[PDB]
């Protein structure tokens, strides 16, 4: 029926000792390079990408949709460049959810000029539940989330036909 887009982990605060300014030519906009407005790229700064345990408690009293990604680089050295750790883990939990992500190096065929890929994942934190993110590298952290309301009388239609 409705939802509301809201900055779950704000860029200019929530990531103090990680460099958030990650961008790509593959996500081009009007000439320049850009990225996903609802997601956010965390890279290693100064020394390393130190351990993180970013948490969000569902206050909203609505099903909050959370979207995060996991980056799988194509070259051994690129992994050690942007994330300063050769063996990385991404952990995503809720009261009734668990998943452990181990990104692995693969020189895959070039889709939109990228041998390396980002896998996209999603969950719905129920009102009252808490989402905790443990990582030491390769996490494409969320930026904006969606706190939906639902209500059938809606659907996905594939049409060419114009609106009036």
């Amino acid at each position, epitope marked *: 029926s409705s939802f509301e887009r809201f900055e779950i982990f704000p860029k200019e605060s929530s990531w103090p000792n990680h460099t958030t300014t*990650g961008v790509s030519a593959s996500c081009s906009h009007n000439g320049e390079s850009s990225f996903y407005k609802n997601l956010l790229w965390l890279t290693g700064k100064n020394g390393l990408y130190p351990n993180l345990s970013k948490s969000y408690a569902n206050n909203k009293e609505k099903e909050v949709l959370v979207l995060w990604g996991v980056h799988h680089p194509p070259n051994i050295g690129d992994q050690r460049a*942007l994330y300063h750790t050769e063996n990385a883990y991404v952990s995503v939990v809720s009261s009734h959810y668990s998943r452990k992500f181990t990104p692995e190096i693969a020189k895959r065929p070039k889709v939109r000029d990228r041998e390396g890929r980002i896998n996209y994942y999603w969950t719905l934190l129920e009102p009252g539940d808490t989402i905790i993110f443990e990582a030491n590298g390769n996490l494409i952290a969320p930026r904006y989330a969606f706190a939906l309301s639902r209500g059938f009388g809606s659907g996905i239609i594939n049409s060419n036909a114009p609106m009036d």
Partner: antibody
Amino acid sequence: EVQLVESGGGLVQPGGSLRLSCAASGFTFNIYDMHWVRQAPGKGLEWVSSITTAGDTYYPGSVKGRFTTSRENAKNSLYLQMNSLRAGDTGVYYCTRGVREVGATGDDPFYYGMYVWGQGTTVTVSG
Amino acid sequence: EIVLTQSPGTLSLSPGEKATLSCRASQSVSSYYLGWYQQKPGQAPRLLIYETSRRATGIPDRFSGSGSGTDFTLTISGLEPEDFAVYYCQHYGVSPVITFGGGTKVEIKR
């Protein structure tokens, strides 16, 4: 191979306007941040402008006022608009390539440093 | 804010020798950003060292780079005739201020 061809002018009025053009060749432009480093008539290297792949311009207090950086990822060129030019704004202006985006495959190496340099183009203010 | 003070002001040695030029900034620099560039007389500058230790993708082995936090050093073991340049240490990275600035005018004087 890799090359940064710098072009522009030489003479302007004190408080005048000039534009510099930086042609590039031998590498993928759009995935590298760019900069302008000036060496005074005397000596001493100083950074004046820097633009990301995203188009975010950063300037030093010396020149924050009247200088502006632009990019034509299409024309493989980078530009510097030098407005209301001061006295000390004299010297040789250089074109440089530092860091590879973040999201740029893994082929072209990722490092914090400037590698490809240009020959320069000398700029002076009148009397 | 970040001040890259390059000591000595001027360095002068005979060929075949070893040179040690230092560069110490106000606060800690956390290595990964600091590099060294050779301003060869009458020409465009050139990169030699990056991320502190790192060598250039086409530069001699005579040149060594090392240091941490405040104090940093580029060490030329060979000191050939070509190796008589002015040199500068630069702080390139997440700041956005590049800082730069340097002296150490490595010349002959025998």
